[PDB]
């Protein structure tokens, strides 16, 4: 995955990717990738 | 081989969308079963039931 930084915190994800990690646009603001919150 | 594939490019659009439709259907099948609750319940440390 290129163009999206990785952050260790977990939130509820909206755009699925696979293998338990999603991507979302949060806080300027940029696209981030994180493990989804169950 | 790719030049003659343009005559059947509409066929491959159907097949690629079909496998994409299968993949999203298999993905949402797990959420329709296991993801019934929005909250995760922790097991209490007391095992005296
Ligand atoms: C997230 O926090 C953990 C806590 O130890 C740390 O190990 C990890 O490096 C952190 N990740 C980032 C991207 O800062």
From Swiss-Prot, chain A:
It is found in: Virion membrane; Host endoplasmic reticulum-Golgi intermediate compartment membrane; Host cell membrane. Glycans are attached at residues 8, 27. Changing residue 4 to V: In strain: 19B/501Y. The cytoplasmic Cys-rich domain is palmitoylated. Palmitoylated spike proteins drive the formation of localized ordered cholesterol and sphingo-lipid-rich lipid nanodomains in the early Golgi, where viral budding occurs. Specific enzymatic cleavages in vivo yield mature proteins. The precursor is processed into S1 and S2 by host furin or unknown proteases to yield the mature S1 and S2 proteins. Processing between S2 and S2' occurs either by host CTSL in endosomes, or by host TMPRSS2 at the cell surface. Both cleavages are necessary for the protein to be fusion competent. Cell surface activation allows the virus to enter the cell despite inhibition of the endosomal pathway by hydroxychloroquine. The polybasic furin cleavage site is absent in SARS-CoV S. It comes from the Viruses. The chain holds residues 650 to 699 of 1273 of the full protein. It comes from Severe acute respiratory syndrome coronavirus 2 (2019-nCoV). Disulfide bonds join 13-22. Main component of the anti-COVID vaccine Chadox1/AZD1222/AstraZeneca; in which the human tPA leader sequence is added in N-terminus to enhance protein secretion. Changing residue 24 to A: No effect on O-glycosylation by host GALNT1. Variant D614G has become the most prevalent circulating sequence in the global pandemic since April 2020. The mutation is associated with higher viral loads produced in cell culture and animal models. It would not change pathogenicity nor neutralization properties vs vaccination. May be prevalent because the mutation increases virus transmission in human population. Belongs to the betacoronaviruses spike protein family. This is Spike glycoprotein. Contains sequence and structural motifs very similar to those of a bacterial superantigen and can directly bind and activate T-cell receptors. Activation of a broad T-cell repertoire may be involved in the hyperinflammatory syndrome in acute COVID disease. The KxHxx motif seems to function as an ER retrieval and binds COPI in vitro.
């Amino acid at each position: 995955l290129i163009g999206a930084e990785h952050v260790n915190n977990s939130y509820e994800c909206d755009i699925p990717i696979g293998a338990g990690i999603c991507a979302s646009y949060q806080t300027s603001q940029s696209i981030i990738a994180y493990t989804m919150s169950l | 081989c790719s030049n003659l594939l343009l005559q059947y490019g509409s066929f491959c659009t159907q097949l690629n969308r079909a496998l994409t439709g299968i993949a999203v259907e298999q993905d949402k099948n797990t959420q329709e079963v296991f993801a019934q609750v929005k909250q995760i319940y922790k097991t209490p440390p007391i095992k005296d039931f």
